[PDB]
Design an enzyme around this catalytic site. Structure first.
Site, PDB file in Angstrom:
ATOM      1  N   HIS A   1      70.988 -78.790  15.164  1.00 21.30           N
ATOM      2  CA  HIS A   1      69.745 -78.047  15.347  1.00 21.30           C
ATOM      3  C   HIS A   1      68.906 -78.581  16.492  1.00 21.30           C
ATOM      4  O   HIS A   1      67.865 -77.985  16.792  1.00 21.30           O
ATOM      5  CB  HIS A   1      68.929 -77.958  14.043  1.00 21.30           C
ATOM      6  CG  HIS A   1      68.250 -79.230  13.615  1.00 21.30           C
ATOM      7  ND1 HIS A   1      68.639 -79.938  12.502  1.00 21.30           N
ATOM      8  CD2 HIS A   1      67.148 -79.857  14.089  1.00 21.30           C
ATOM      9  CE1 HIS A   1      67.839 -80.981  12.335  1.00 21.30           C
ATOM     10  NE2 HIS A   1      66.928 -80.957  13.291  1.00 21.30           N
TER      11      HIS A   1
ATOM     12  N   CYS B   1      65.349 -86.860  12.338  1.00 20.99           N
ATOM     13  CA  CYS B   1      66.681 -86.285  12.209  1.00 20.99           C
ATOM     14  C   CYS B   1      67.688 -87.054  13.056  1.00 20.99           C
ATOM     15  O   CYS B   1      67.376 -87.561  14.134  1.00 20.99           O
ATOM     16  CB  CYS B   1      66.679 -84.810  12.610  1.00 20.99           C
ATOM     17  SG  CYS B   1      65.816 -83.828  11.374  1.00 20.99           S
TER      18      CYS B   1
ATOM     19  N   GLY C   1      60.983 -86.089  13.828  1.00 18.37           N
ATOM     20  CA  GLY C   1      61.629 -86.997  14.750  1.00 18.37           C
ATOM     21  C   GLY C   1      62.706 -87.864  14.136  1.00 18.37           C
ATOM     22  O   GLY C   1      63.454 -88.509  14.884  1.00 18.37           O
TER      23      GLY C   1
END
Ligand SMILES: *[C@H](O)[C@H](C[C@@H]1CCNC1=O)NC(=O)[C@H](CC(C)C)NC(=O)OCc1cccc(C(F)(F)F)c1
Ligand SMILES: *[C@H](O)[C@H](C[C@@H]1CCNC1=O)NC(=O)[C@H](CC(C)C)NC(=O)OCc1cccc(C(F)(F)F)c1
Ligand code: NA
Ligand code: NA
Lengths: 303, 303
Positions: free
Chosen positions: B41, B145, B143
């Site tokens: 993503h 991920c 932030g």
């Protein structure tokens, strides 16, 4: 979001852990530049540990009595000295992985990460708070002495704890990296007890702010109290008195939530009197006091 | 002695964390050999994230759209591909700090350490259990991920989790390192809910054994029960059924304590019916289910 007890990443300290052997005693040491720091009781024997004279013990040692191992590589000891309850072994190689570091002594109520080690090899990392009675509630087995506690700030490691022993109640005691004990303890096998402890009030309030930021609101109320009236309740429940400095340090959390400190104090008062009635706060059924305001802001400012 | 929730030392994983930027989206990646793994993503935009077609999105990317940074040093991307919900960016340098590693998928009830990272920089380490409903109760801000979960066994890192998102209840969801989600979740911004959860019975029993080994005995009793009769109580309190395999895995702890598993089950039954009556077990006022039998043996065999 979420709030979890969280240690600092341990890599910078892992690169400093070595194994120190003297006689049949093996523990951990901290290798910074060309010096290895470890508990001086490594030079004790089974019969010395009752009431040893460490100055005599060290005078009778030579450099070759100290086996230092950084992994497989043995480090050659070229000098030895004592600084309070820590031994300093000078070695012939500067640790190439030495981080920027400081030796700091911490205050009761402050937290630090512990890197638990055995045979110079790190095994686990966890957070501890220095209790008001200068003990910590750790997890340490035989062989863990010389494990250190630390905080990290912009790649500077502030070492604040070296592990030395376990008290009869199962809590743990050690020194700063200058070798000075936290609390009224000595490095010998005798009858030592921690004094009575108290609850760290500013930390409980910080954790209640963490709870609100993460959506736990059931304990809030419309009431506010005064500082003097709250400290009366604190005395009854063995909580430390709340100071104006503590109110100021909680300022940011009160601003982020819109809940004044003395507003939150009314909630704590009711929790102390009534309990939780089967409910939980941030996954706990007790009031948690081992998170500092800094610890909370670290995880909750983004929410 | 002592029993503490404890993460694995994070050094081996810290040396693998990089920052991956695509457009205005920045998250973390895992750099192993000459490949960087991160959530796919990262190639989404503010309007793509509602229901994106990732195959179309990746076909429209080129290597130069991916900014990889290992600290200050920018890594040059020489290829890109998708594997389920993870993106693989091939780079022109093999990570010299690559540990021995495996990609493993874990089972509900098992634990792992999470190295929470922001902008490719590690910030904290903590333990998580994979819940029966395939979520974890973490601490993750925007932030985070690409932060990973792992276990370590003899200097081999088994990666089992990469972080992708937070659900509406505040719990967290992600994939294995093959990019396959844990649980019935998808990497887009929609209405997703975790199913109902249950309590991990074998873990609660392991923690009660940890408690006994550490001197908490107030909940013990002279009674024993049968496996079928215990599983009747487990159903009523939303606990998972106890299997004979679970009894076998608890064998070592039962041997060390001299308390048969079905003996300990009688204690759990009474704790479930009566509660604790103001007492605590290993510092908790609730029954804890996020410690595996392995986690307990790691800290309690020496005691
Ligand atoms: C150093 O590795 C060791 C760390 C102790 C061992 C168990 N838990 C710990 O934290 N420190 C000592 O053994 C210490 C040495 C004296 C100060 C010279 N003594 C000590 O802690 O005695 C208390 C104790 C309690 C339970 C178990 C032990 C045992 F492991 F040594 F048997 C000792
Ligand atoms: C990736 O860094 C991020 C991690 C989230 C952000 C907050 N806590 C986390 O764990 N993941 C996402 O933002 C994810 C992306 C989609 C799958 C494409 N979406 C998501 O988690 O949305 C839920 C959410 C909940 C609270 C706050 C946020 C915010 F931080 F993005 F605003 C998002
Ligand atoms: Na109030
Ligand atoms: Na029993």
């Amino acid at each position: 979001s979420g709030f979890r007890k969280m240690a600092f990443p341990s890599g910078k300290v892992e690169g400093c852990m070595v194994q120190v052997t003297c006689g049949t005693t093996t523990l951990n040491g901290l290798w910074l530049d060309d010096v290895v720091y470890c508990p001086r009781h490594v030079i004790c024997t089974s019969e010395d540990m009752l009431n040893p004279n460490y100055e005599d013990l060290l005078i009778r040692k030579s450099n070759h009595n100290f086996l230092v191992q950084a992994g497989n590589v043995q480090l050659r000891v070229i000098g030895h000295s004592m600084q309070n309850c820590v031994l300093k072994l000078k070695v012939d190689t500067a640790n190439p992985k030495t981080p920027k570091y400081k030796f700091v002594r911490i205050q009761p109520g402050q937290t630090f990460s512990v890197l638990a080690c055995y045979n110079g090899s790190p095994s686990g990392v966890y957070q501890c708070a220095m209790r008001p009675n200068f003990t910590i509630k750790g997890s340490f087995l035989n062989g863990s002495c010389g494990s250190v506690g630390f905080n990290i700030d912009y790649d500077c490691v502030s070492f604040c704890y070296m592990h030395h022993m376990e008290l009869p109640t199962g809590v743990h005691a050690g020194t700063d990296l200058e070798g000075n004990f936290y609390g009224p303890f000595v490095d010998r096998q005798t009858a030592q007890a921690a004094g009575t402890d108290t609850t760290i009030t500013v930390n409980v309030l910080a954790w209640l702010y963490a709870a609100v930021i993460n959506g736990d609101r059931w304990f809030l109320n419309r009431f506010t109290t005064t500082l003097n009236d709250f400290n009366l309740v604190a005395m009854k429940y063995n909580y430390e008195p709340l100071t104006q400095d503590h109110v100021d340090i909680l300022g940011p959390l009160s601003a982020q939530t819109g809940i004044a400190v003395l507003d939150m104090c009314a909630s704590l008062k009711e929790l102390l009197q009534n309990g939780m009635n089967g409910r939980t706060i941030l996954g706990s059924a007790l009031l948690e006091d081992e998170f500092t305001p800094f610890d909370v802001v670290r995880q909750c400012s983004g929410v």
